[PDB]
Design a protein around this ligand. Structure first.
Ligand SMILES: O=C(O)c1ccnc(C(=O)O)c1
Ligand SMILES: [Mn+2]
Length: 210
């Protein structure tokens, strides 16, 4: 049956996921206030054009490096640099906890979700980003789904291969099978209240530029 295939796939996805709670209630509160500062600055028109991407239920803020399966890296300096508080409050903690080495992160993206927000099935562009992919969830708890046939064929398949809880203050690290061989997504029903995520990545040298 398809039950053995779904279990073997989930096994493979799991081996590409590492997760741990690194940030306390207070550390989150400090970072969450800084994320609110970023939303204000965007609204004040203080950022470069390509720094901010506005969409109905979700907003994206690109720092260090940003982009538009033919994604392209904007020319150097076209997006705002990674704010100091990100280096100080987020990247440092990860470096101290041996999640990623120092100097690795050149790209930080903040996704800001409304309740009812979602991300459609995708693979983090392999031509743009190196692995691993690190992400830290903030305002509330949610879930990350892997294997996303269901978003398009809910008749033939009603569930993802795997759902991963992403609680406030947790660090999720994706590599191998989980980052390369399978799509991920977030379902609208899994975002009940406001949610933000900071995604920390290194871009590839040969990432096709504009
Ligand atoms: O919101 C998230 O946690 C999340 C998870 C996986 N991918 C993305 C993305 O923006 O690519 C965001
Ligand atoms: Mn992603």
């Amino acid at each position: 049956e398809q039950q053995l295939q779904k279990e073997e796939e989930a096994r493979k996805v799991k081996s590409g996921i590492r997760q741990m709670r690194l940030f306390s209630q207070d550390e989150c509160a400090k970072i969450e206030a800084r994320i609110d500062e970023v939303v204000s600055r965007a609204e004040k028109g203080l950022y470069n054009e390509h720094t901010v991407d506005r969409a109905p239920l979700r907003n994206k803020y690109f720092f260090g490096e940003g982009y538009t399966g033919q994604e392209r890296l904007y020319p150097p300096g076209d997006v705002d640099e990674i704010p100091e508080w990100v280096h100080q409050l987020v990247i440092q903690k990860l470096v101290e906890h041996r999640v990623i080495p120092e100097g690795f992160v050149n790209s930080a993206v903040i996704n800001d979700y409304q309740p009812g927000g979602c991300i459609v099935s995708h693979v983090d562009p392999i031509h743009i980003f190196e692995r691993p992919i690190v992400s830290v969830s903030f305002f509330s708890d949610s879930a990350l789904c892997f294997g996303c046939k269901f978003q398009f064929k809910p008749i033939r398949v009603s569930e993802p291969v795997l759902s991963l809880p992403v609680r406030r203050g947790s660090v999720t690290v994706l590599s191998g099978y989980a980052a390369d061989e399978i799509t991920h997504c977030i379902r609208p029903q899994d975002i009940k209240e406001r949610r933000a995520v900071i995604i920390l990545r290194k871009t590839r040298l040969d990432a096709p530029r504009l």
